[PDB]
Design a protein around this ligand. Structure first.
Ligand SMILES: O[C@@H]1[C@@H](O)[C@H](O[C@@H]2CO[C@H](F)[C@H](O)[C@H]2O)OC[C@H]1O
Ligand SMILES: O[C@@H]1[C@@H](O)[C@H](O[C@@H]2CO[C@H](F)[C@H](O)[C@H]2O)OC[C@H]1O
Length: 329
């Protein structure tokens, strides 16, 4: 009640978002009502949860999310249309189990994008059209996927054009993680630049920001923001969390974060939101991949069965030290 509200603190800087599902909307309803003005479906707008079999569309869970957001004057980011994960096998196969042709996959891609985007047209203001197409390792530009294998390397151009046709007023995003590591940053930059140089309707870059206490550095974050902003795209931070474990740290037995973990996380969030506020002219939305530590995908990724404490509020929905530094930049 004396607590500052995140969306109000950052009212002149960017929207503040949370990834949700119908369960967490109930479990965290007051935090969301008190703090966010944007919502993303954590899972229920992905392909497998919208069209699990060809021509079987299951919008019920996504509808509940959109209804909640609309009834509390919250924006919605749509996540996500074309991704190498969480897409059913049927999409890439024919009746006899072999891979479809380029033309057939483009038909199915267009039908899915058209049906999904048109349903929420005028309620959802932007879409992550392509998720994580850039290779996360190695020297190649693109990660392998059945989308790319079957259609070809222009599969992303087609996806953006299909979504633009379905809702030409939506902001269309390329969304990715490890977006601040320089080698991947340059691949993402080259990819988006090349699409923009062909007049493809890509309006924004989504920086997932699945970050650790140490990585990426503040200078890497600054360099990535400027690198992407130089393309003239809008920037969203789309899945922010600050993991208590580095990538090499696969420990399972930590029952609580240490005092220094909690303090460093507070400092880290303060530094991050200071940098975001500094780039308020190009960052228009900051969405956390959750909202409080009683629900985070980092409990089971990348190590199944442990516990992480990545967000501004604790499991009892109380502000953490990170909250206070974040709102005081
Ligand atoms: O499934 C994806 C996952 O592979 C990816 O991996 C890590 C995310 O957290 C940091 F960014 C790590 O350094 C990455 O290697 O995160 C996105 C998720 O959708
Ligand atoms: O519940 C998990 C979900 O949170 C996860 O979401 C991805 C997290 O990494 C990025 F933000 C991706 O773009 C998200 O879609 O996906 C796996 C699921 O089990």
């Amino acid at each position: 009640s004396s607590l500052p509200s995140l969306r109000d603190v950052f009212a002149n800087d960017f929207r503040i978002g949370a990834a949700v599902n119908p369960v967490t909307i109930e479990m965290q309803k007051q935090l969301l009502i008190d703090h966010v003005n944007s919502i993303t479906a954590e899972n229920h707008m992905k392909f497998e949860h919208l069209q699990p079999e060809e021509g079987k569309f299951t919008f019920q869970e996504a509808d509940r999310i959109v209804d909640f957001a609309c009834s509390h004057r919250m924006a919605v980011r749509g996540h996500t249309l074309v991704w190498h994960n969480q897409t059913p096998d049927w999409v890439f196969q024919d009746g006899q189990g072999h891979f479809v042709s380029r033309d057939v996959l483009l038909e199915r891609m267009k039908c899915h994008i058209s049906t999904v985007v048109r349903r929420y047209k005028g309620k959802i203001y932007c879409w992550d059209v392509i998720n994580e197409a850039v290779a996360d390792e190695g020297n190649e530009l693109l990660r392998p996927s059945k989308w790319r294998q079957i259609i070809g390397d222009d599969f992303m151009e087609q996806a953006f054009l299909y979504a633009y046709e379905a809702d030409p007023d939506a902001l269309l995003f390329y969304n990715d993680y490890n977006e601040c590591f320089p080698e991947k940053r340059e691949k993402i930059f080259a990819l988006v630049k090349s699409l923009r140089d062909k007049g493809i309707p890509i309006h924004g870059i989504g920086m997932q920001a699945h970050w650790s206490l140490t990585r990426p550095s503040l200078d890497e974050i600054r360099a990535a923001i400027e690198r992407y902003a130089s393309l003239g795209v809008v920037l969203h931070i789309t899945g922010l969390d600050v993991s208590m474990f580095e990538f090499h740290d696969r420990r399972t037995d930590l029952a609580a974060p240490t005092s220094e973990m909690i303090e460093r996380q507070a400092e880290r969030y303060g530094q991050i939101f200071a940098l975001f506020k500094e780039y308020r002219d190009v960052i228009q939305s900051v969405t956390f991949w959750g909202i409080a530590d009683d629900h985070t995908w980092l409990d089971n990724f990348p190590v199944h069965g442990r516990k992480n404490w990545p967000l501004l509020f604790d499991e009892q929905h109380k502000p953490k030290p990170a909250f206070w530094r974040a709102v005081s930049v």
